[PDB]
């Protein structure tokens, strides 16, 4: 509704202009329907959700960032194969400048944080931020995300099948023991969910506008929330899975193929509920 949107926009403005900043009202707003509504609003709100300040604009990239980055060839390759992330209406020139900044953001964060290891798909998170909030803020926000919500993904000692994936099955079991037991016998594992988690579902929801609204939700929530969103998608598809061919090839095949037009607002609700009933 348009009356509701006007009220939500004024409530966001009231929260930004309060003392103290009413961050609690901003999480509520990010969690509730439509999330934060616009990128202009997100440029102000996302840094509050991650508790990052207007700060020393990241001690500049040193000179020769690219020349000293061992991951430059990998990052260049990943970024070049990411054109689909950009509005099809976006002029070629404008897009190629954003690709240049996307490379520099990733490389700068890696250089500032040598304990972090690049992974394929990281650029799907970084480009979303660059498109929403621009290059300086994308850098300081993603850096905060990289050292917290994404750290295990960027840790090569960390075994991603342990850790984050290890939550998915008990979650599904808590809510639907049949589906749990079914997927157990298919020996399907949890690897199917992994691409979703490390790219924050950029290839699960088609509409870029839906993806950014999901980032509102993830930024407002505890860092394990994406696993509950994965769980809720799997549970949504229960019938389709219970009608499957029961093996690691069938089960994988179906779940990996994402339905068009998922009810994201409903699934976002359900992920918050599930989070409450089976917390980390
Ligand atoms: F050009 Be792909 F590496 F098909």
Curated annotation (Swiss-Prot):
<dbReference type="GO" id="GO:1902953">
    <property type="term" value="P:positive regulation of ER to Golgi vesicle-mediated transport"/>
</dbReference>
<dbReference type="GO" id="GO:0031267">
    <property type="term" value="F:small GTPase binding"/>
</dbReference>
<comment type="function">
    <text>GTPase-activating protein (GAP) specific for Rab1 and Rab2 small GTPase families for which it can accelerate the intrinsic GTP hydrolysis rate by more than five orders of magnitude. Also shows GAP activity for RAB18 GTPase. Promotes RAB18 dissociation from the endoplasmic reticulum (ER) membrane into the cytosol, probably through stimulating RAB18 GTP-hydrolysis. Involved in maintaining endoplasmic reticulum structure.</text>
</comment>
<dbReference type="GO" id="GO:0043547">
    <property type="term" value="P:positive regulation of GTPase activity"/>
</dbReference>
<dbReference type="GO" id="GO:0046726">
    <property type="term" value="P:positive regulation by virus of viral protein levels in host cell"/>
</dbReference>
<feature type="domain" description="Rab-GAP TBC">
    <location>
        <begin position="36"/>
        <end position="222"/>
    </location>
</feature>
<keyword id="KW-0812">Transmembrane</keyword>
<dbReference type="GO" id="GO:0005096">
    <property type="term" value="F:GTPase activator activity"/>
</dbReference>
<dbReference type="GO" id="GO:0005789">
    <property type="term" value="C:endoplasmic reticulum membrane"/>
</dbReference>
<dbReference type="GO" id="GO:0070309">
    <property type="term" value="P:lens fiber cell morphogenesis"/>
</dbReference>
<dbReference type="GO" id="GO:0005783">
    <property type="term" value="C:endoplasmic reticulum"/>
</dbReference>
<dbReference type="GO" id="GO:0000139">
    <property type="term" value="C:Golgi membrane"/>
</dbReference>
<feature type="site" description="Arginine finger">
    <location>
        <position position="81"/>
    </location>
</feature>
<dbReference type="GO" id="GO:0072520">
    <property type="term" value="P:seminiferous tubule development"/>
</dbReference>
<dbReference type="GO" id="GO:0033116">
    <property type="term" value="C:endoplasmic reticulum-Golgi intermediate compartment membrane"/>
</dbReference>
<protein>
    <recommendedName>
        <fullName>TBC1 domain family member 20</fullName>
    </recommendedName>
</protein>
<dbReference type="GO" id="GO:0090110">
    <property type="term" value="P:COPII-coated vesicle cargo loading"/>
</dbReference>
<keyword id="KW-0343">GTPase activation</keyword>
<dbReference type="GO" id="GO:0019068">
    <property type="term" value="P:virion assembly"/>
</dbReference>
<dbReference type="GO" id="GO:0031965">
    <property type="term" value="C:nuclear membrane"/>
</dbReference>
<feature type="site" description="Glutamine finger">
    <location>
        <position position="120"/>
    </location>
</feature>
<feature type="transmembrane region" description="Helical">
    <location>
        <begin position="214"/>
        <end position="234"/>
    </location>
</feature>
<dbReference type="GO" id="GO:0034389">
    <property type="term" value="P:lipid droplet organization"/>
</dbReference>
<dbReference type="GO" id="GO:0007030">
    <property type="term" value="P:Golgi organization"/>
</dbReference>
<keyword id="KW-1133">Transmembrane helix</keyword>
<comment type="subunit">
    <text>(Microbial infection) Directly interacts with the N-terminal amphipathic helix of hepatitis C virus (HCV) NS5A.</text>
</comment>
<keyword id="KW-0472">Membrane</keyword>
<dbReference type="GO" id="GO:0006888">
    <property type="term" value="P:endoplasmic reticulum to Golgi vesicle-mediated transport"/>
</dbReference>
<keyword id="KW-0945">Host-virus interaction</keyword>
<dbReference type="GO" id="GO:0044829">
    <property type="term" value="P:positive regulation by host of viral genome replication"/>
</dbReference>
<dbReference type="GO" id="GO:0001675">
    <property type="term" value="P:acrosome assembly"/>
</dbReference>
């Amino acid at each position: 509704f348009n009356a509701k949107r006007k009220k939500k926009v004024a409530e966001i403005h009231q929260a930004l202009n309060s003392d103290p900043t009413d961050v609690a009202a901003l999480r509520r707003m990010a969690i509730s329907e439509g999330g934060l509504l616009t990128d202009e609003i997100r440029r102000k709100v996302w840094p509050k959700l991650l508790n990052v300040n207007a700060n020393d604009p990241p001690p500049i990239s040193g000179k020769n960032l690219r020349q000293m980055s061992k991951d430059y060839q990998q990052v260049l390759l990943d970024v070049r194969r990411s054109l689909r992330r950009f509005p099809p209406g976006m002029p070629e020139e404008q897009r190629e400048g954003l690709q240049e900044e996307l490379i520099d953001i990733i490389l700068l964060i890696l250089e500032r944080n040598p304990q972090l290891h690049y992974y394929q798909g990281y650029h799907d998170i970084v480009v979303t931020f660059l498109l929403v909030v621009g290059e300086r803020l994308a850098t300081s926000l993603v850096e905060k995300l990289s050292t917290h919500h994404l750290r295990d993904f960027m840790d090569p000692t960390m075994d991603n099948t342990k850790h984050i994936l290890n939550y998915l099955m008990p979650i599904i079991d808590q809510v639907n023991p049949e589906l749990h037991d079914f997927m157990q016998s298919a020996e399907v594992g949890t690897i199917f969910a992994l691409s979703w988690l490390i790219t924050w579902f950029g290839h699960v929801l088609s509409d870029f506008r839906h993806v950014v609204r999901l980032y509102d939700f993830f930024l407002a929530c505890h860092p394990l929330m994406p696993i509950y969103f994965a769980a809720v998608i799997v549970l949504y598809r229960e019938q389709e899975v219970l009608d499957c061919d029961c093996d690691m090839a069938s089960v994988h095949h179906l779940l990996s193929q994402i339905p068009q037009d998922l009810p994201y607002e409903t699934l976002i609700s359900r992920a918050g509920d599930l989070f409450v009933q089976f917390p980390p």
